[PDB]
Amino acid sequence: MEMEKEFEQIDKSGSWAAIYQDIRHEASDFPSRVAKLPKNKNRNRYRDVSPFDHSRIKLHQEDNDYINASLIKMEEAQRSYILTQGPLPNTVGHFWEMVWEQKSRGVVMLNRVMEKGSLKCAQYWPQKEEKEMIFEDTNLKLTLISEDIKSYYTVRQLELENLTTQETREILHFHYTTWPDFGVPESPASFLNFLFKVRESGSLSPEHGPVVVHCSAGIGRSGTFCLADTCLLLMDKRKDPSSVDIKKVLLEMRKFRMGLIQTADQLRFSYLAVIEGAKFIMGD
Numbered sequence: 001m002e003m004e005k006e007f008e009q010i011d012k013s014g015s016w017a018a019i020y021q022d023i024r025h026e027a028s029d030f031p032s033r034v035a036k037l038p039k040n041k042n043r044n045r046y047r048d049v050s051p052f053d054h055s056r057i058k059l060h061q062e063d064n065d066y067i068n069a070s071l072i073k074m075e076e077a078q079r080s081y082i083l084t085q086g087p088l089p090n091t092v093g094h095f096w097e098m099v100w101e102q103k104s105r106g107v108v109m110l111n112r113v114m115e116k117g118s119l120k121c122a123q124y125w126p127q128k129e130e131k132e133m134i135f136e137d138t139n140l141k142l143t144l145i146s147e148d149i150k151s152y153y154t155v156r157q158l159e160l161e162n163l164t165t166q167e168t169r170e171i172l173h174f175h176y177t178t179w180p181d182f183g184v185p186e187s188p189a190s191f192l193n194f195l196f197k198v199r200e201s202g203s204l205s206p207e208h209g210p211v212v213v214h215c216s217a218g219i220g221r222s223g224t225f226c227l228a229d230t231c232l233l234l235m236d237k238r239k240d241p242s243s244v245d246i247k248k249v250l251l252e253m254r255k256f257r258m259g260l261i262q263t264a265d266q267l268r269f270s271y272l273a274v275i276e277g278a279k280f281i282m283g284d
């Protein structure tokens with residue numbers, strides 16, 4: 001069923017809350033035993049948001065390999081994403097260790113450091129060229145190279161150095177700065193423009209490690225970003241683009257991380273983004 005018609009049918013009937021609860025009920029439940037070990041309590045931002053054991057990213061160290069991060073592997077679309085929480089004061093070194101070890105080119109940030117008057121993630125990147133950051137626990141150095149500030153997003157060029165080998169890599173930081181403190185954006189235009197920019201950078205392409213995507217919990221806005229990207233890629237690859245079922249794609253992604261899409265309004269926004277996006281895809 002063409003999703004645009006499914007959309008108008010749900011909107012006219014006002015059943016968004018009903019559809020959303022059906023997804024919640026059918027979603028996968030897999031063990032997260034490593035996340036719940038007492039040694040890992042200060043590595044989790046939220047008690048109710050944990051990576052599944054089968055899909056968690058492992059840090060390459062013998063001490064403690066745990067980070068709150070999941071590998072989302074979309075077999076038909078040929079895309080992989082790492083979805084993670086906003087880093088905590090004691091996990092900023094783990095975060096950059098993961099980017100290094102997984103060979104990521106891009107980090108996608110969908111939150112502000114402060115929202116609703118509270119801290120939603122650590123200040124984990126340098127704000128001035130001449131004041132670099134050193135992570136002594138993981139032996140990394142991070143330098144701000146350049147910053148491009150636009151109305152709806154900021155792009156940063158960062159240099160990450162493995163202090164052990166003196167190898168360096170260029171990381172691109174894509175920061176969406178205008179998601180509202182409450183609800184979802186009224187139009188998906190600026191969100192789609194932003195995805196367009198991440199794609200154009202090479203950050204989502206198979207010659208690199210998976211993109212790292214985060215918000216505060218790494219399930220809501222983060223969920224919306226990967227769901228929209230994968231649905232648009234499938235509409236490009238298939239003979240019958242109308243066969244793309246956004247609810248079935250979301251349930252496939254929920255095999256790899258719990259809780260993706262946190263509200264009925266985020267579900268409606270994801271539909272709106274894909275419907276508008278495909279327009280820009282089908283010759284326009």
Ligand SMILES: OCc1cc(C(F)(F)F)ccc1N1CCOCC1
Pocket residue numbers: 192193195196199232276277278280281284
């Ligand atoms: O050509 C497709 C396209 C065009 C634009 C445009 F028109 F603004 F230039 C923006 C985004 C996209 N992609 C990426 C995510 O959103 C939908 C698909």
